[PDB]
Amino acid sequence: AVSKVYARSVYDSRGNPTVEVELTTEKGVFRSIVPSGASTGVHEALEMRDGDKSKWMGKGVLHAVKNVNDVIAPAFVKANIDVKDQKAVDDFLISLDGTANKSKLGANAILGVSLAASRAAAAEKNVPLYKHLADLSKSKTSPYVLPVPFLNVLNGGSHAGGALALQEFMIAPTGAKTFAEALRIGSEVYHNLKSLTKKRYGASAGNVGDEGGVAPNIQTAEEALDLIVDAIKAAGHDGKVKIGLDCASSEFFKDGKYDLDFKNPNSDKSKWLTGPQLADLYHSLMKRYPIVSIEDPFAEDDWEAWSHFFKTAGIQIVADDLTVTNPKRIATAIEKKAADALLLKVNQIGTLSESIKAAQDSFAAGWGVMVSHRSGETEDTFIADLVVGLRTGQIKTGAPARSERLAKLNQLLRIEEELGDNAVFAGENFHHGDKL
Amino acid sequence: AVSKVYARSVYDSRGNPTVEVELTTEKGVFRSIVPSGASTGVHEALEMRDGDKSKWMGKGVLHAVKNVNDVIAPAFVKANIDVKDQKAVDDFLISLDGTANKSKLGANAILGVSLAASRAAAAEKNVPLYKHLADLSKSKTSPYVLPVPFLNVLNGGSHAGGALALQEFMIAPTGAKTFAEALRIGSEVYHNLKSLTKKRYGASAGNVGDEGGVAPNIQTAEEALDLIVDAIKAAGHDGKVKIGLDCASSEFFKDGKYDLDFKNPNSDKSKWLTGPQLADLYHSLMKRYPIVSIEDPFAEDDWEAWSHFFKTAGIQIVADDLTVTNPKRIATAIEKKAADALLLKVNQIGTLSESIKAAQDSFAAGWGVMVSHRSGETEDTFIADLVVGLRTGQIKTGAPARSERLAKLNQLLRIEEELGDNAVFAGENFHHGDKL
Ligand SMILES: [Mg+2]
Ligand SMILES: [Mg+2]
Ligand SMILES: [Mg+2]
Ligand SMILES: [Mg+2]
């Protein structure tokens, strides 16, 4: 029984204010913190900011916070809802906002309540969060599946200063036998990468991006990939580690063309690429490097481009800004055969229930599901329990550096240990972890 | 009644393993995570690493973990100690190691148990950590004192790739009325700095160091301070923000001289400076910038240089590597009049009890106490409750970027809120916050 709902302003991993919510019950106080992206898709739910340039550079969230305290709270408490009933909770919240993109109260106002409720519910059932989560989603729990982590060891695009267009370059230790081993191999590659990087491009190149990866000032994907393969090799893990990319192409799409030098204000329009051209580029990288997954190869509404590449790709193709964890967007994606994996971001849609549906819809279509954090994270470890609850077999929560990332990775170590013989690591079958 | 003592290996903010301890009582599970330094003094208690180059590059902690699980555990449980008596807990652990520097079990194995015990006690006494702490240390609680945060917005030395020798360039919002206000302005400054940096030094210059600060490739302190001052002004906080430094001189002390270009393998020996020469430089900077604190201006055992400088300092002079949170070392410094402020690090000494004593002896001698994190941090927020419990009035826990840093800051916002009207912000009186 909820006796209280309260919100406050806290800081994210980038030093920007964010919403933190606290829910009180007979069982105790439950907390949750909302994340925040940088390369946020146009179709994402509304993230409300104060816009006051005299405070936090106009990035405060007093309004959103106010909505929780002044509007949401009173009613919620009055409603007397069963926290164990996620759908109920969410329905209430959505009903309260009334808009399609949560423009009334704001997604960051709603999310926090939604997430806090699930925590309170788990306490009530006297079960671990990932367990309640599996319950909510009707996932198979025998056994549970530990996912393969996709570590963004090299940052580009909007996550770091430099010429690199592509946003994330990740390593996936699909060759590990357990979650612990995977993370060990992952950090080993990471340390080698930092050394090489400094060695090949100067000390400064070893400084890090928003997500904790090294951020060398290079201009081609080839140079980034060469470093990674050399690092994997130097670490002694060749063949056990694969690569995944996050192109975040919408960030550089302009006038129906893709600008690979978009970070340069004086970019050369003649160099801009067409969908098909960009597809040729991707293909070149695929043939040369052990890439097993590409995210956002084409812009958020460039449907034809995704569908075209999809038929020749032959590897996991993840939709991020294209789907925005929105069941309706996914249906279209599914119809157009544009991708084969969903990038799940609680904050793109705004409610847990809606996110769980997105996952269920994807899995129903034979798609894969990759749970993810946002570039602006917090000490909150929700997603760790989530990926296990949903049995996706794959997560992306950063490089093995910067605590907003390790918190989730460490959390996964604790769960694996707890589960013992009741869990298996996804390994090479990460694409369809849910079916393991 | 402690039923179980357990430990596991987790990862720090740089991707290196570390010790995580869990203490189980009738009241629940209490956890603690140990931080790890980079520019560690020769006198620090022993941090135990495995040295198996085939795993984690030799930085494993399996041994320390095993020490806790197989050595400390059984004897601790069987001892039936009362967690409420910190002293008895610590005395027990120390006697068990039996070395001057915790070289048998490792300080990293010991600290986790010591700190975890204090959490369990607080639960038992049904009080917030900071209160239990203020209790353990006989601090005056009316009101409580909230500390000024020293934010390390510009990183150098061993914390980042680049030429900059001095380790940390910090801002301190002493001209704020509340901690919440302090952090607010601190971040605003921070955002301004990052922008300016990128403009003045280039995109890559905005990338960050280990502690969340920007890392421009500059060679002089003046370049650094100039960036900062412009940032303060630009953000509109001219007057409310002061500057602090962590020179970490021990790292560049060689042959009785100081090398301001120590990262350069071709450093110019003729350029190396004498103590008095270095002191000159300092006085030069203090004259031109609102610097209010200097940490480790001289080497760990270069006593005479310290004593010399102290005579005409006229500002807070903090001892770090020189004192290593060691009472015996503190005695010496007080006597030789080397500094007037202690840098408190539980991991430099090893037990909560010993660290408390250190603070007490410092306050007794009329010194101030700056509570501190380590460059290799975790999601643990213990020090937030610690600074408050000791009522020091000042803490250093990083820039407002990277959750290993924000987690502590967020936690202080929470406490501020909770204390309400029963607490004051130290402001301009940080030096003697304990006398407020
Ligand atoms: Mg994005
Ligand atoms: Mg993405
Ligand atoms: Mg140091
Ligand atoms: Mg220091």
Sketch the major β-sheet of chain A: 9 strands, mixed
Morphology call of chain A = globular
Task: Report the strand count of chain A.
Answer: 16
Ligand catalogue: magnesium ion
Please name the fourth-level CATH homologous superfamily of the largest domain in chain A: Enolase-like C-terminal domain
What is the string of helix and strand elements of chain A?
A: EEEHHHHEEEEHHEEEHEHEHEHHEHEHE
Subunit structure (chains A, B): Homodimer.
Catalytic activity (chains A, B): (2R)-2-phosphoglycerate = phosphoenolpyruvate + H2O
Pfam families (chains A, B): Enolase_C (PF00113), Enolase_N (PF03952)
Subcellular location (chains A, B): Cytoplasm
Supply the key terms:
homodimer; 436 residues; alpha/beta; Enolase-like, domain 1; 2 domains; nine-stranded mixed β-sheet; three-stranded antiparallel β-sheet; globular; binds magnesium ion; carbon-oxygen lyase
